[PDB]
Amino acid sequence: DYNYKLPDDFMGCVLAWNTRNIDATSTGNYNYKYRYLRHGKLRPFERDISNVPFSPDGKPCTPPALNCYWPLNDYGFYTTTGIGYQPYRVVVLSFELLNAPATVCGPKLSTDLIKNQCVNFNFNGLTGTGVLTPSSKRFQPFQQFGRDVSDFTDSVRDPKTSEILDISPCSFGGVSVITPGTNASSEVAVLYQDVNC
Amino acid sequence: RCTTFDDVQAPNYTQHTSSMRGVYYPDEIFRSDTLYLTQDLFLPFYSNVTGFHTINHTFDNPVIPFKDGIYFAATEKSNVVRGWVFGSTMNNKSQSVIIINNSTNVVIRACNFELCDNPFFAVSKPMGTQTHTMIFDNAFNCTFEYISDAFSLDVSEKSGNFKHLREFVFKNKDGFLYVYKGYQPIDVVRDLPSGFNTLKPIFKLPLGINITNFRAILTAFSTWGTSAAAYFVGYLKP
Numbered sequence: 300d301y302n303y304k305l306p307d308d309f310m311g312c313v314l315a316w317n318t319r320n321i322d323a324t325s326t327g328n329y330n331y332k333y334r335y336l337r338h339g340k341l342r343p344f345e346r347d348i349s350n351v352p353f354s355p356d357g358k359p360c361t362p363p364a365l366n367c368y369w370p371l372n373d374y375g376f377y378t379t380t381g382i383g384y385q386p387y388r389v390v391v392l393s394f395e396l397l398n399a400p401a402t403v404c405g406p407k408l409s410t411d412l413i414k415n416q417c418v419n420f421n422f423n424g425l426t427g428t429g430v431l432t433p434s435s436k437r438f439q440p441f442q443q444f445g446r447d448v449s450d451f452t453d454s455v456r457d458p459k460t461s462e463i464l465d466i467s468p469c470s471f472g473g474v475s476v477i478t479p480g481t482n483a484s485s486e487v488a489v490l491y492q493d494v495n496c
Numbered sequence: 497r498c499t500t501f502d503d504v505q506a507p508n509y510t511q512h513t514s515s516m517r518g519v520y521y522p523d524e525i526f527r528s529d530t531l532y533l534t535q536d537l538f539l540p541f542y543s544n545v546t547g548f549h550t551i552n553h554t555f556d557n558p559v560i561p562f563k564d565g566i567y568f569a570a571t572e573k574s575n576v577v578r579g580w581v582f583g584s585t586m587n588n589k590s591q592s593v594i595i596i597n598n599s600t601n602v603v604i605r606a607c608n609f610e611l612c613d614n615p616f617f618a619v620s621k622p623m624g625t626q627t628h629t630m631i632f633d634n635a636f637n638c639t640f641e642y643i644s645d646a647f648s649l650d651v652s653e654k655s656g657n658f659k660h661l662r663e664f665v666f667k668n669k670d671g672f673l674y675v676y677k678g679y680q681p682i683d684v685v686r687d688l689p690s691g692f693n694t695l696k697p698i699f700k701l702p703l704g705i706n707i708t709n710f711r712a713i714l715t716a717f718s719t720w721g722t723s724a725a726a727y728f729v730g731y732l733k734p
Contacts, residue, residue: 345706348608
């Protein structure tokens with residue numbers, strides 16, 4: 300991890316699986332290489348393949364002179380070693396939920412939009428509900444997800460039909476019942492609904 | 497090829513301001529009538545911006561340190577500064593992405609390169625024809641490949657005020673390379689004018705490399721000559 304850094308905040312999925320049958324041979328596989336000489340910690344999602352002998356103070360080296368080791372400890376995986384020395388093929392699947400034109404989708408079938416209120420909209424993993432009326436907003440082609448004055452799913456591009464539409468949420472609010480006194484009259488209450496007729 | 501010109505004059509590091517430049521859309525988000533805050537890497541207003549005036553005698557593209565992100569202005573009515581190499585030390589040991597244009601198509605490609613000490617295309621001064629690539633020769637342990645769309649370019653030398661302007665911001669961020677396009681018409685002699693313009697994102701290059709240094713690539717009008725079309729560099733700050 301000092302030669303392959305994964306950042307703390309940004310995500311990924313660690314997929315490792317044992318290969319004692321495949322990548323572990325009793326003569327050893329010295330093709331699977333491994334670095335140990337590196338000046339400082341390595342930046343996340345980066346690498347440096349360069350096989351250069353490093354001087355710890357910093358000098359142009361020439362191996363095998365003093366303090367000019369090769370930067371590699373190339374391990375040969377045997378099929379007779381313990382579990383801590385078995386070869387593991389490790390695939391790290393980083394993701395991008397950065398809302399570009401949505402590339403890697405899921406197997407869900409795509410329905411069609413309705414202007415009607417309160418639709419469980421799922422525009423590329425953006426769940427929720429609301430009135431889904433089309434509107435007139437500019438939407439440059441490098442911006443596909445508009446927000447409110449402070450941070451909400453407000454306006455999206457329909458990723459199939461490339462249409463501009465904003466979301467008003469479902470018509471919430473308080474409900475205020477209005478009664479005369481029940482000892483005076485248990486007659487039926489009248490009610491608000493705090494939105495609209 | 498390692499073909500250096502004879503009359504090559506070093507830069508004097510002429511300082512100018514970053515007046516109202518280096519502003520980009522920080523995210524893929526439509527925002528309307530809001531006074532929104534953002535802490536990303538940005539070019540500060542009124543910074544020390546290093547100039548590089550490539551007149552017929554003075555040839556200016558040194559190996560400039562990158563340092564957490566750069567701004568790149570280019571006064572180009574003449575379309576000269578066509579190419580960048582973002583490497584660690586720009587040797588055959590380290591990896592260097594090369595972002596050039598072959599006057600019809602932008603090429604982004606990252607590998608180990610033996611870097612030329614002075615690369616240029618064999619381009620005549622009145623005609624402006626791109627014939628011989630002299631930028632990459634050797635390419636081994638290569639990882640990244642990209643070839644863009646097609647759109648034409650005028651290589652030849654214009655005159656008077658600059659009819660275009662090339663604003664760029666490169667960010668080494670999370671093992672990527674964010675590229676930001678700047679395209680506006682101006683009218684100036686050699687100065688970087690105090691003009692505001694917003695940049696758009698174009699490339700999110702999934703490379704992942706220690707970028708410490710860089711060098712711009714000049715399309716020299718070839719014992720050589722260049723137009724009065726300078727370029728500027730500035731750094732970014734969080």
